[PDB]
Design a protein around this ligand. Structure first.
Ligand SMILES: Cc1cc2c(cc1C)N(C[C@H](O)[C@H](O)[C@H](O)COP(=O)(O)O)c1[nH]c(=O)[nH]c(=O)c1N2
Ligand SMILES: O=C(CCNC(=O)c1ccc(OC(F)(F)F)cc1)N[C@@H]1CCCc2ccccc21
Ligand SMILES: O=C(O)c1cc(=O)[nH]c(=O)[nH]1
Ligand SMILES: [Cl-]
Ligand SMILES: [Cl-]
Length: 355
């Protein structure tokens, strides 16, 4: 933990640009070249939501394993669920390089990858190669999410997402549609999600995933009200809150703070927590939320859970602190739940709203 945080990760940081580090991290993870996480998950961390058991509530957010190459290595790291993607219908290269920037002084990253994606067919075949292994993992409390994007040149965003539902829906425990990358009307949102849900409902029952909407933290109050209304009206299964921010909070120190793209990590944390809090209230606590943005400790995770998240994800912290951060978050969260009088994660979900 301290070796990765203080010695290993800062050293490798000096030699590689951030995208090269990302590529190497995916390769090492896919090869299982990481010690199998030692933390054995307490019963206190189990969460039942979205039609599944989650052995622990700490997932890897989309954008780490964009193309479904490292799923098993991510479970080995101790994540209670894995989200791959975003995956676009056709392969596409994304934006020109450089397109990922570290802000070490802020424990933040700015990225403008632009949905670089191997495309649905490649990812489909990759997931098919381990489909029954995943079924067993899911039954054992380790579900798989697939985040669906759209191609840069698409003339019909809803059809891109519908294609993703059809192709990867059958391989996913849940699907995600962003209504939120920074790098690509209410009735239109309703139209898009109606089409997505119709396609999902058309899949055979054992292949029918939950559908979540992933939002940015940069929405207006009107946008959030509208999203909550549409989600309730259509029966969307959950929300992922949040994607990266195109805002630049006051106080960023990194030299690269004015690069275009989505900001992640610590400066996003509380903006994300507050968005969770608002979306939980606007949905009357009836819509599961996966909380994400700036989680690097048990306290960060519990703040999102108490604000309304049933599950959390992290990404940027993994890239600064390495794999040990996963067990750290889980151990700290367990300890804080005990300290605060909760029987388990489930009892803490939304607890701030009942104060
Ligand atoms: C380099 C990089 C790349 C991506 C992302 C992030 C980063 C840093 N994120 C967003 C990610 O899933 C998450 O929502 C935010 O990064 C906030 O979480 P952290 O602060 O990183 O824990 C992201 N989200 C998404 O829905 N699809 C994607 O393809 C990506 N790609
Ligand atoms: O650069 C950072 C923050 C600081 N960390 C490193 O520079 C770094 C270097 C080597 C490393 O070891 C590995 F074996 F080479 F991977 C792991 C991390 N984050 C990037 C950008 C976003 C995506 C991503 C994904 C994985 C790793 C880094 C990053
Ligand atoms: O591919 C990207 O640029 C990307 C997508 C997304 O949803 N979020 C993000 O921060 N980057
Ligand atoms: Cl299938
Ligand atoms: Cl706390």
């Amino acid at each position: 933990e301290r070796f990765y945080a203080e010695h290993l990760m800062p050293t490798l940081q000096g030699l590689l640009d951030p995208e090269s580090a990302h590529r190497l991290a995916v390769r090492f993870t896919s090869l299982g070249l990481l010690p199998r996480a030692r933390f054995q998950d307490s019963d206190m961390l189990e969460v039942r939501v979205l039609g599944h058991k989650f052995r622990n509530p700490v997932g890897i957010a989309a954008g780490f394993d964009k193309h479904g190459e490292a799923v098993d290595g991510l479970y080995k790291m101790g994540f209670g669920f894995v989200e791959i993607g975003s995956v676009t219908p056709k392969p596409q290269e994304g934006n020109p390089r450089p397109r990922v920037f570290r802000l070490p002084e802020d424990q933040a990253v700015i990225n403008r990858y632009g949905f670089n994606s191997h495309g649905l067919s490649v990812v489909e075949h990759r997931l098919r190669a381990r489909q029954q292994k995943q079924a067993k993992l899911t039954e054992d409390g380790l579900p798989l999410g697939v985040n669906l994007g759209k191609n840069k040149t698409s003339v019909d965003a809803a059809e891109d997402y519908a294609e993703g539902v059809r192709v990867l829906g059958p391989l996913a425990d849940y699907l995600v549609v962003n209504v939120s990358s920074p790098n690509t009307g209410k009735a239109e949102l309703r139209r898009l999600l109606t089409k997505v849900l119709q396609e999902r409902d058309g899949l055979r029952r054992v292949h029918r995933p939950a559908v979540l909407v992933k939002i940015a933290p940069d929405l207006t109050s009107q946008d959030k009200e509208d999203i909550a209304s549409v989600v309730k009206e259509l029966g969307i299964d959950g929300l992922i809150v949040t994607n990266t921010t195109v805002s630049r909070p006051a106080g960023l120190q990194g030299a690269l703070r004015s690069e275009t793209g989505g900001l992640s990590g610590k400066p996003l944390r509380d903006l994300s927590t507050q968005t969770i809090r608002e979306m939980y209230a606007l949905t009357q606590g009836r819509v599961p939320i996966i909380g994400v943005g700036g989680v690097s400790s048990g306290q960060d995770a519990l703040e999102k859970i108490r604000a309304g998240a049933s599950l959390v994800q992290l990404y940027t912290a993994l890239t600064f602190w390495g794999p040990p951060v996963v067990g750290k978050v889980k151990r700290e969260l367990e300890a804080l739940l005990k300290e605060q009088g909760f029987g388990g994660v489930t009892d803490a979900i939304g607890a701030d709203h009942r104060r």
